[PDB]
Symmetry: C2
């Protein structure tokens, strides 16, 4: 009975200078995810195994398959778009 | 040989009005993850099963274990804090 219905953020516009940095951000979220997992005893394995706490994405963000990177970048942009949609202003400083 | 070293965003300060909305954001990010997974053939299962594409967190955001909700909120906050550290102003309009 559960149908996910994310908000339409398609017409939400971000500063290009911010989108240019999507990898920095995505890489940073990846680092946070990885430090945590590793802190809970996870380690790299080619196959994912919950029993031996083994994960194939526990590698430097750069080693990640490009679709994982793509996913992380989009997730980050969605997060920020959502902030904008909630009545907040984002602008580069000076 | 890989040691994650995330940026220290401890001293990054966000508007309280935004942090107040952290669940809303976290819920939306969850919906997006969920629509995708389901689009790729995943469904709910008590136990995660990659072979049968079964996932426990394919439930309405509200029904999630509190630790997952908590993880999602912090992730979102980290994300937004990262924007701030990169030289951007975030302010309620």
């Amino acid at each position: 009975d559960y149908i996910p219905e994310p908000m339409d953020l398609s017409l939400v516009d971000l500063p290009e200078s911010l989108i240019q940095l999507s990898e920095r951000i995505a890489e940073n979220v990846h680092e946070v995810w990885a430090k945590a997992a590793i802190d809970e005893g996870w380690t790299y394995g080619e196959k994912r195994d919950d029993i031996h706490k083994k994960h194939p994405c526990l590698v430097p963000y750069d080693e990640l398959p490009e679709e994982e990177k793509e996913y992380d970048r989009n997730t980050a942009m969605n997060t920020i778009k959502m902030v904008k949609k909630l009545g907040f202003r984002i602008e580069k400083e000076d």
